Design a protein around this ligand. Structure first.
Ligand SMILES: *[C@@H]1O[C@H](CO)[C@@H](O)[C@H](O)[C@H]1NC(C)=O
Lengths: 49, 49, 49
């Protein structure tokens, strides 16, 4: 049941981490049954700026 | 001076500190198939005879 | 089976304890003893299944 708590921003002003309170709303989950080794990420390397 | 197969030579063993970790190097052990009980974990069992 | 049903295998040797509700399929060799086990499977090497 992969936790995907998330929430969009109404009034971000473009500065790093503005102060305030806002919660998150789950959407879906998925069972996995494996253990923890490491993590990795990757964006779409066909275009970057 | 080991005995023959039809009349094999016996042995009795009683109160004694047993450590099954000294015979491994003393013989080549071409065949080392013991009983189904865990061959690796043999230093954690207590018996009366 | 009249000879033996060699379709079921059970794991015997593991490094440590096991958490609830996970699977540990791993076709490996037990790296026991001082000598580096290289799939020898003889003495001081063990096939966990
Ligand atoms: C736990 O994660 C490690 C990291 O790779 C892995 O080697 C190990 O097999 C995992 N545990 C099980 C029971 O599969």
């Amino acid at each position: 049941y992969f936790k995907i708590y998330s929430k969009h921003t109404p009034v971000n002003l473009g500065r790093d981490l503005p102060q305030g309170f806002s919660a998150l709303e789950p959407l879906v989950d998925l069972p996995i049954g494996i253990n923890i080794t490491r993590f990795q990420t990757l964006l779409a390397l066909h275009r970057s700026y | 001076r080991f005995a023959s197969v039809y009349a094999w030579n016996r042995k009795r063993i009683s109160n004694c500190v047993a450590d099954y970790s000294v015979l491994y190097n003393f013989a080549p052990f071409f065949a080392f198939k013991c009983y189904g009980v865990s061959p690796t974990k043999l230093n954690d069992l207590c018996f009366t005879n | 089976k009249v000879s033996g049903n060699y379709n079921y295998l059970y794991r015997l040797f593991r490094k440590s304890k096991l958490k609830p509700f996970e699977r540990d399929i791993s076709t490996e060799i037990y790296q026991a003893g001082n000598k580096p086990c290289n799939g020898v499977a003889g003495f001081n090497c063990y096939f966990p299944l």
